[PDB]
From TrEMBL, chain B:
The chain holds residues 54 to 106 of 369 of the full protein. This is Major capsid protein. It comes from the Viruses.
Length: 52, 53
């Protein structure tokens, strides 16, 4: 992470800003996945009181 | 060497300060100046304790 600090106004409002520069992708050779099986079931909220 | 002399006067500051936490950068005062000059010249005169007689 590249931490940077910048003061906006004569010392008022210090700012801390950071960010990473990276990329992600699930490996797809041809048109088929390579190493993940997406098990896709039915999972109901066991507690119906949740606002959702 | 000079036919003139110019001097300067710096007036006070007058500006509403920024109360609160609103930004102040960008509202800077002018520092108004005033000046005037004096022009130099010479004056001479002569008196004659005249006559040999």
């Amino acid at each position: 992470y590249d931490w940077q600090e910048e003061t906006k106004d004569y010392g008022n409002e210090p700012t801390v800003a950071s960010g990473f520069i990276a990329g992600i992708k699930k490996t797809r050779f041809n048109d088929r996945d390579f190493g993940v099986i997406s098990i896709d079931t039915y999972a109901k909220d066991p507690n119906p009181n949740n606002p959702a | 060497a000079g036919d003139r002399v110019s001097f300067d006067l710096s007036v006070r500051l007058r500006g509403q300060p920024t109360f609160g936490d609103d930004r102040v950068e960008g509202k800077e005062e002018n520092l108004k100046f005033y000046t005037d000059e004096v022009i130099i010249d010479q004056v001479r005169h002569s008196v004659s304790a005249g006559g040999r007689m």
